């Protein structure tokens, strides 16, 4: 019924070859060549551990979330968001939590600028964690699934989990499937209470309808979601557009 549901049905009809040509058509991406080569060699300075550092940097450099004080990073994985925040002037502590174990990335130890204010803790399912006081709440959880009802369930669970962590603080939260009417209802209620806006990051793949609820902005959630569904549906029409290439983020070295 929603434009997003039509997008997901069409995405599920693609062959692997078609899917591989669609997923990056017209997106933006950072060139990870140098970082991957450095990481393979065990280099611990300058490189971002994942594409996530540039993905969060995109929101921060637009002032959509402005990390400060004690940052919590839920679903930190290898730690791209955490290591990026560790170098920001207003940040004083970064605590990352992630599941780890089979099927999940482990935190990567690094020596990028501000490493000494970061603690990444694996073996932590955030759905069992009691909330902690923080000045910035980040969450990048939401596992894609071919089933949109599984994605709807996973999105609602994240939105219910994150709310007790929100106390008039800065935030950036992934919304895996933002187009279902039940999710829209939660998002509108959450925006009435905590403010912010839902934003599509250009570095996201066309194979996910993810959007991020960020704290600094206003706007109409329904309009923003439908614009993304129409964008993703239009990207099935034409031949692959190679992604727009950008430089990856240099996270430096040193303590603070």
Ligand X SMILES: C[S@@+](CC[C@H](N)C(=O)[O-])C[C@H]1O[C@@H](n2cnc3c(N)ncnc32)[C@H](O)[C@@H]1O
Ligand Y SMILES: Nc1cc(Cl)ccc1NC(=O)Nc1cccc(S(=O)(=O)Nc2ccc(C(=O)O)cc2)c1
Active centre residues (catalytic): 55, 140, 174, 210
Q: How many CB atoms lie within 10 A of CB 207?
A: 16
| Residue ranges of E strands in 64-218 | 69-74, 91-97, 118-121, 136-139, 170-175, 197-199, 211-214
- Output the CA torsion 235→55→213→111 (10° steps): 160
Q: Is 141 in the site for ligand X (CB under 6 A)?
A: yes
Give the interface segment with ligand X, choosing from 28-36, 50-58, 86-94, 182-190 (CB under 6 A).
Answer: 50-58
| 39 or 173: CB nearest ligand Y | 173
Q: Which does 227 bind (CB under 5 to 8 A by kind): ligand X, ligand Y, none?
A: ligand Y
Kindly identify the residues of this chain, within the stretch 163-202, that bind ligand X according to CB under 6 A. Answer: none
The residue to which tokens 């992934």 are assigned: 174
**DSSP H or E run through 175:** strand 170-175
Q: Is 75 in the site for ligand X (CB under 6 A)?
A: yes
Q: How far is the CB of 37 from ligand Y (least distance, A)?
A: 30
Q: Give the residue, chosen from 7, 58, 59, 81, that forms a contact with ligand X under the rule CB under 6 A.
A: 81
Q: How far apart are CA 132 and CA 88, in angstroms?
A: 21
Q: Which does 75 bind (CB under 5 to 8 A by kind): ligand X, ligand Y, none?
A: ligand X
Q: Is 80 in the site for ligand X (CB under 6 A)?
A: yes
Beta bridge partners of 30: 246
Three-state DSSP at 17 gives: helix
Q: Residue 25 annotated as binding?
A: no
Q: Is 137 in the site for ligand X (CB under 6 A)?
A: no
């Amino acid at each position: 019924e929603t434009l997003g549901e039509k997008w997901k049905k069409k995405l599920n009809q693609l062959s692997r070859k078609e899917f591989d040509l669609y997923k990056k058509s017209g997106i933006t991406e950072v060139d990870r060549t140098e970082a991957k080569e450095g990481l393979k060699r065990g280099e611990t300075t300058h490189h971002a551990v994942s594409r996530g550092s540039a993905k969060l940097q995109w929101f921060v450099e637009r002032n959509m979330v402005i990390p400060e004080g004690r940052v919590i990073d839920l679903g930190c994985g290898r730690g791209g968001w955490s290591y990026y925040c560790a170098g920001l002037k207003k940040v004083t502590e970064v605590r990352g939590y992630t599941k780890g174990g089979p099927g999940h990335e482990e935190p990567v130890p690094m020596s990028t600028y501000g490493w000494n204010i970061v603690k990444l803790m694996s073996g932590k399912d955030v759905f069992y964690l009691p909330p902690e006081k923080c000045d910035t709440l980040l969450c990048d959880i939401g596992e894609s699934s071919p089933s949109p009802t599984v994605e709807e369930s996973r999105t609602i669970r994240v939105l219910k989990m994150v709310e007790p962590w929100l106390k008039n603080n800065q935030f950036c939260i992934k919304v895996l499937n933002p187009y279902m009417p039940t999710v829209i209802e939660h998002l509108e209620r959450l925006q009435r209470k905590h403010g912010g806006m839902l934003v599509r990051n250009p570095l996201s793949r066309n194979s996910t309808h993810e959007m991020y609820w960020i704290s600094n902005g206003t706007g109409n959630i329904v309009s923003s979601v439908n614009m993304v569904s129409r964008l993703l549906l239009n990207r099935f029409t034409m031949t692959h557009r190679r992604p727009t290439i950008e430089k990856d983020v240099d996270l430096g070295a040193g303590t603070r």
